């Protein structure tokens, strides 16, 4: 999308392959704010908002928290409390066309600044003079939306950077999007510290003949202690027994 018509998609109810994006490294700028590139990225996210817009290379710096500029104040504002990553990568082959591609537009002037998630699609001509414009473009009336004009042979500062702003809030109570969570392998027949789906315990794993219902993860026998647990890695039910101990 163009910068003025910033396109939003909601990433909901899916696990996310955060690690592979880092592995790709096709992005020139990876300035992440608040979440950082860490294990914190690979954890529960309430909502994930993806925003795409093709901007100038020089204006990439502007779309950072607490920064000001034309793109910042007239096209897409930035949350000062932004928790998220800003990616810019060169689209010179893809988004530059011979003789210029004049389809991506930007708002040079606007009446006031914009809210952090403001999508102004208005075509009303900006007025800077005592004379009302009345829909005719003249002196004291200059069209707000101007065409950047990316050219194939131009500096990278004057070449397109596709930007996919990814907003992640850190409360994580809904947890609609989560990371892979680094599942391990099975090591049964020895005393081990087990943590199948969130219950830390100590004991030895063995094959279980119990048939758990599909909505049940772990099982408790008489006197309210864990007896069998189903690992969701391969929907396998395993019997937990304490490893050998006794007096001497």
């Amino acid at each position: 999308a163009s910068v003025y018509a910033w396109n939003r998609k909601r990433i909901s109810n899916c696990v996310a392959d955060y690690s592979v994006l880092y592995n790709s490294a096709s992005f020139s700028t990876f300035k992440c704010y608040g979440v950082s590139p860490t294990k914190l990225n690979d954890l529960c996210f309430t909502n994930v908002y993806a925003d795409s817009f093709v901007i100038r290379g020089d204006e990439v710096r502007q779309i950072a928290p607490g920064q000001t500029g034309k793109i910042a104040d007239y096209n897409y504002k930035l949350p000062d409390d932004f928790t998220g990553c800003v990616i810019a990568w060169n689209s010179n082959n893809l988004d530059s066309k011979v003789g210029g591609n004049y389809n991506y537009l930007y708002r040079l002037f606007r009446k006031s600044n914009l809210k952090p998630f403001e999508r102004d699609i208005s075509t009303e001509i900006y007025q800077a003079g005592s004379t009302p414009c009345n829909g005719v473009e003249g002196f004291n009336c200059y069209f707000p939306l101007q065409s950047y004009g990316f050219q194939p042979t131009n500096g990278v500062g004057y070449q397109p950077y596709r930007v996919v702003v990814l907003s992640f809030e850190l409360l994580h109570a809904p947890a609609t999007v989560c990371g892979p969570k680094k599942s391990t392998n099975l090591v049964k027949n020895k005393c081990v510290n087990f943590n199948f789906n969130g219950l830390t315990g100590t004991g030895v794993l063995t094959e279980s003949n119990k048939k758990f219902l599909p909505f049940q993860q772990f099982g408790r026998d008489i006197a309210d202690t864990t007896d069998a647990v189903r690992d969701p890695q391969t929907l396998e039910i395993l019997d937990i027994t304490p490893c050998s101990f006794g007096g001497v």
Partner: antibody
Amino acid sequence: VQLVQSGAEVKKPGSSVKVSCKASGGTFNTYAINWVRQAPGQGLEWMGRIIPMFGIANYAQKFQGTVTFTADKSTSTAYMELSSLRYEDTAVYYCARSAYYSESSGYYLDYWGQGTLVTVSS
Amino acid sequence: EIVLTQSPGTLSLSPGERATLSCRASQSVSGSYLAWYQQKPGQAPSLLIYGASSRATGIPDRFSGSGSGTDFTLTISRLEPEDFAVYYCQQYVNSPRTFGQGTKLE
């Protein structure tokens, strides 16, 4: 670069007509399209402009409610519709292109079409 | 709304000397948003100048503007017989952009 339009209209009075100015490749998106009446044996009158990309048409006080401007993003063709043929509506309509962008000198009609003749007959 | 009156309305014959055909407006043209046009008989107008003096592609620099405020000059080095077209003025300011009445109409 070349803006072939309609040539002549055979319209009995009160019967509507649509003009078919054709924009060349890259003309519609970059430049707006303007319409000029050019009444017979008289001067040039600016009817209005079509901004094709955003579909915005704004008219002068005189022609408001009597003429309709439309443009087709696909096939790059500019259209002007006359509501009905009033007796004075006879003319040689012209289509021309200007640049909305302020960063390049614009709003002046760069290039013009051949002209569309509306009359009582041929 | 802005009005324009061209002053040398008609020159019947071609003596070939330079003519300083003019345009005047009720409110002074702001930022020199005026353009001249060449309308040869039987054909569409062609842009001749823009701004106050900026020339045009494919039109020789013999055509010279010399205006400010109430922009009022379009001059030519010599008057060619073939190059005898009605010349129009259109403001491109926020007003209705209504052309003048023409300065070379036979």
